[PDB]
Design a protein around this motif. Sequence first.
Motif, mmCIF file in Angstrom:
data_model
loop_
_atom_site.group_PDB
_atom_site.id
_atom_site.type_symbol
_atom_site.label_atom_id
_atom_site.label_comp_id
_atom_site.label_asym_id
_atom_site.label_seq_id
_atom_site.Cartn_x
_atom_site.Cartn_y
_atom_site.Cartn_z
ATOM 1 N N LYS A 134 95.733 24.679 92.389
ATOM 2 C CA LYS A 134 95.143 23.525 91.715
ATOM 3 C C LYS A 134 94.092 23.936 90.696
ATOM 4 O O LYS A 134 93.716 25.105 90.624
ATOM 5 N N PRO A 160 104.113 20.672 88.301
ATOM 6 C CA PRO A 160 102.670 20.428 88.244
ATOM 7 C C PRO A 160 102.385 18.934 88.202
ATOM 8 O O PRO A 160 103.084 18.206 87.504
ATOM 9 N N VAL A 161 101.410 18.490 88.987
ATOM 10 C CA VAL A 161 101.005 17.084 89.020
ATOM 11 C C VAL A 161 99.602 16.956 88.444
ATOM 12 O O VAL A 161 98.721 17.751 88.755
ATOM 13 N N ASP A 163 96.006 15.935 88.048
ATOM 14 C CA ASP A 163 94.946 15.614 88.985
ATOM 15 C C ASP A 163 93.947 14.653 88.329
ATOM 16 O O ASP A 163 94.013 14.391 87.140
ATOM 17 N N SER A 164 93.015 14.146 89.123
ATOM 18 C CA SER A 164 92.066 13.134 88.659
ATOM 19 C C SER A 164 91.015 13.689 87.684
ATOM 20 O O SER A 164 90.436 12.937 86.923
ATOM 21 N N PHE A 169 97.938 20.432 89.677
ATOM 22 C CA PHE A 169 98.138 21.108 90.941
ATOM 23 C C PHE A 169 99.609 21.171 91.300
ATOM 24 O O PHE A 169 100.420 20.406 90.793
ATOM 25 N N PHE B 5 93.836 18.593 98.281
ATOM 26 C CA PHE B 5 95.152 18.417 97.668
ATOM 27 C C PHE B 5 95.725 17.149 98.263
ATOM 28 O O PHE B 5 95.643 16.957 99.487
ATOM 29 N N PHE B 7 99.544 15.653 98.084
ATOM 30 C CA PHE B 7 100.906 15.891 97.605
ATOM 31 C C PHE B 7 101.826 14.708 97.832
ATOM 32 O O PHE B 7 101.847 14.128 98.936
ATOM 33 N N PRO B 8 102.624 14.376 96.813
ATOM 34 C CA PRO B 8 103.580 13.274 96.933
ATOM 35 C C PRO B 8 104.752 13.662 97.806
ATOM 36 O O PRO B 8 104.881 14.837 98.154
ATOM 37 N N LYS B 98 91.659 11.008 96.984
ATOM 38 C CA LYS B 98 92.839 11.286 96.187
ATOM 39 C C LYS B 98 93.835 10.163 96.379
ATOM 40 O O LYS B 98 93.924 9.595 97.464
ATOM 41 N N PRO B 159 109.720 22.519 85.111
ATOM 42 C CA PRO B 159 109.101 21.204 85.314
ATOM 43 C C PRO B 159 109.690 20.193 84.341
ATOM 44 O O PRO B 159 110.017 20.561 83.216
#
Lengths: 208, 208
Positions: A134, A160-161, A163-164, A169, B5, B7-8, B98, B159
Amino acid sequence: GPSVFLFPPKPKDTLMISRTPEVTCVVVDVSHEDPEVKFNWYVDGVEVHNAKTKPREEQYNSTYRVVSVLTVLHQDWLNGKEYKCKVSNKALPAPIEKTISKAKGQPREPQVYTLPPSREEMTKNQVSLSCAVKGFYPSDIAVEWESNGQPENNYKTTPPVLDSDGSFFLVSKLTVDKSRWQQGNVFSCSVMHEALHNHYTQKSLSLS
Amino acid sequence: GPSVFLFPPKPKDTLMISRTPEVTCVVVDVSHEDPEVKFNWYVDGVEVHNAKTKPREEQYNSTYRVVSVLTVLHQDWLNGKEYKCKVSNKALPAPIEKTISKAKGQPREPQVYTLPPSREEMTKNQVSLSCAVKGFYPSDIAVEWESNGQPENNYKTTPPVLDSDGSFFLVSKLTVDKSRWQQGNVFSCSVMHEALHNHYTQKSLSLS
């Protein structure tokens, strides 16, 4: 009708000077009737002529597919130059244009954490080792797994997602035989990213 | 300090009713001094109590890592319910929160295209088969490779990249021994996405 892909370089290629990054323009569903495809490449709006177009390939359904590849200089990529692939064909109302460029923003350093098998998971013919990353920016990153000089390829890395805090991450999960985890073999998660020292870090993990 | 973290679910899990999607909250770098971590889960702002928190794990550096998992119902995910993990610890100024939720927008159907080895690439101990996918929304997608009922795991999937029309594209590259490509083995790219019929399509490829 004709459809276009424009793929960015592989992260690993942009990060190592000894490698050759390249952008790939892929045209699909071009008709048998007018099979001629013209590529025009541009770097920051200016046409370039050093792309390597491959010979067209007839599909089983009579359509053609064609690939054109443009090498990218490492300095050009880092300088945020826009790469454009324009694709022209008689069966098009207008030429199709695709663009890719390196994301803009301050690079941020990946934090890498490995996670061993759970106790409840620690009871099957197969276990999963996690490599969670992350805090990285941009989202271009290469994550690989290895053990004893030999690559481990049975792993899946999540996209990759966002993040806020504007960083990214992900997690990469390596699936190995529970037995190999028991032999005390060391497994290494290697991560390459522009914001890392030497564009490289490695985290290793084993039983006990 | 403590790092989180969230995670979805795995795309494949959300797409198949027989599977169990779940959201995973992972807390790292919690100090030896105050090792107590409290998780609070929320679905659309309302607290829930069915999460399964795992026992804390002491790290070699004295810090702890802790994982909490919340099962997600398939209908809840599709209805766009927001899942929130709040993490509290004495060494925190404020709790860390989160969130993850399914992306909003009209689903769009992936177009899948396979590409065989080039002629110039067709001259080495290893060849790469490509499975290019575009036009999909949301970016949640599962792409796998197989041959003769046996999974092929030596593949890398880029990705998803945002396209100019608001949809996503990617490519998955399977690396096999040039010999196996010659034996005339069929290789199949399977793609699962919400916008596909039956959440599933497969594209197959072989020499000739």
